[PDB]
């Protein structure tokens, strides 16, 4: 029914600012609250602030007062968030949400309609393809270390997809350098190390990089 | 500012069982302006209950909320597989709005000790100026685990990062990888590199180590 469509993902250097938009398809907008909520990777939801568009009346949690601005446009049913002086802790998914409506048209306070989210990554890094390092090995473990790439994502396969059972590809971590790093491992029979070649295939579309790395015993 | 504390942090149950989630506030929520939300991985949150006890339209009938004052409860009368997700309580009584820290509903299972593996850095990475040591914990349950890096019997702090997979949909286990990153010079200075693992399934801490040189 009513849907909130948010703008696309952003990459911002530290110290800069980001502006994201949220447009409602239809329904009541001017007399219902519109709140912004963010979620850092792996953590919980954080209520940042909201606005009552008809009154142009915002409300911010004290943590963000000075860096956060929330505005609204009633003619187009659009709200804008602006966050300045960006730091690495601001890397998160930012959600737009509209107040739920009740029995008659009574505002219910809770957030009933949610946007799809906008991802904001705060990093000083430029686009870089990954370096792929071997994790050398009656069960043996082996894998590849996909280190120092930007941005997400990276796809990883093994033996051109013929090896799927026992593979664990871990979610990437954002290091202090502003670059991502992940590991992909697989468990194989120890007797197979001498006669079975194991190759990890890595794709990084943002840099148009394909890598194949043979992993062999020490 | 009103602080909301949810409990427990992780609820481990099976489909068909009853789930009882708690949310306690630092201040009386006098008009019951308390809501519950559900969130699945990679999706936006969804409103379940408003006004402490009014289930939102379209939300299945197995979800219901109760409580008043400072103690509130979300009950899922009979868990379905899609109900295994994270749940948040939120107050809209006094600004600012605040969420609880979240409660995860995971699949119940018997305790399983991890298989522990350690990987020294490759020569290709060493000849680039950095050294990464990887400690792998494979197919364990529950998710909580303690991984300690020790270099020449010295506890490491502030130079490691770990990642955990989602619960496996076939056997309900987790896997974890911890990565210790040093400069090539610091790596070449020491000899013994060890990762110590404490887990509920382990009778005593497990240590996998190697000497730089073998």
């Amino acid at each position: 029914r009513v849907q909130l469509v948010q703008s696309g993902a952003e990459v911002k250097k530290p110290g800069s600012s980001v502006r994201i938009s949220c447009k409602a398809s239809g329904g009541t907008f001017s007399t219902l609250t519109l709140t912004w909520v963010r979620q850092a990777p792996g953590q919980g939801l954080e209520w940042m602030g909201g606005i009552i568009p008809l009154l142009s009346l915002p409300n911010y949690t004290q943590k963000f007062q000075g860096r956060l601005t929330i505005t609204a446009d009633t003619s187009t049913s659009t709200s804008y968030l602006e966050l300045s002086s960006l730091r690495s802790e601001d890397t998160a998914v930012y959600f737009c949400a509209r107040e739920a409506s009740g029995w008659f048209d009574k505002p219910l306070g809770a957030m009933g309609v949610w946007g799809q989210g906008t991802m904001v990554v705060v990093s000083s890094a430029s686009t870089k393809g990954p370096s792929v390092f071997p994790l050398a090995p009656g069960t043996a473990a082996l894998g590849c270390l996909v280190k120092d790439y930007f941005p997400e994502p990276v796809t990883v396969s093994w033996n051109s997809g013929a090896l799927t059972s026992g593979v664990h590809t871990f979610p990437a971590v954002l290091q202090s350098s502003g670059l991502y790093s992940l590991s992909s491992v697989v468990t194989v029979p120890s007797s197979s190390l001498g006669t079975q070649t194991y190759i990890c295939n890595v794709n990084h579309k943002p840099s148009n990089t394909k890598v194949d790395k043979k992993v062999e015993p020490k | 500012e009103i602080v909301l504390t949810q409990s427990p942090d992780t609820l481990s149950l099976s489909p068909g069982e009853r789930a009882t989630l708690s949310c306690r506030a630092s201040e009386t929520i006098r008009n019951n302006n308390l809501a519950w939300y559900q969130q699945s991985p990679g999706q936006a949150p969804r409103l379940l209950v408003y006004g402490a006890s009014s289930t939102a339209t379209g939300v299945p009938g197995r979800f219901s909320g109760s409580g008043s004052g400072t103690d509130f409860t979300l009950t899922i009368s009979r868990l379905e597989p899609e109900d295994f997700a994270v749940y948040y309580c939120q107050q809209y009584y006094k600004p600012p709005g605040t969420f609880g820290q979240g409660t995860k509903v995971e699949f119940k299972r018997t305790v399983a000790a991890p298989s522990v593996f350690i990987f020294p850095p490759s020569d290709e990475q060493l000849k680039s100026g950095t050294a990464s040591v990887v400690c792998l914990l494979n197919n364990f349950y529950p998710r909580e685990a303690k991984v300690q890096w020790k270099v020449d019997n010295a506890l490491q702090s502030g130079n490691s990062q770990e990642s955990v997979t989602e619960q496996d949909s076939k056997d309900s286990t987790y896997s974890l990888s911890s990565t210790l990153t040093l400069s090539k010079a610091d790596y070449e200075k020491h000899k013994v590199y060890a990762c110590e693992v404490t887990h509920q399934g382990l009778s005593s801490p497990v240590t996998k180590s190697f000497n730089r040189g073998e």
Partner: peptide
């Protein structure tokens, strides 16, 4: 007073118009 409460303003706008 719930009057000054930002969370209650949309409820008051709905009651004032009705």
């Amino acid at each position: 007073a719930s009057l000054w409460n930002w969370f209650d303003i949309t409820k008051w706008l709905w009651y004032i118009k009705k």
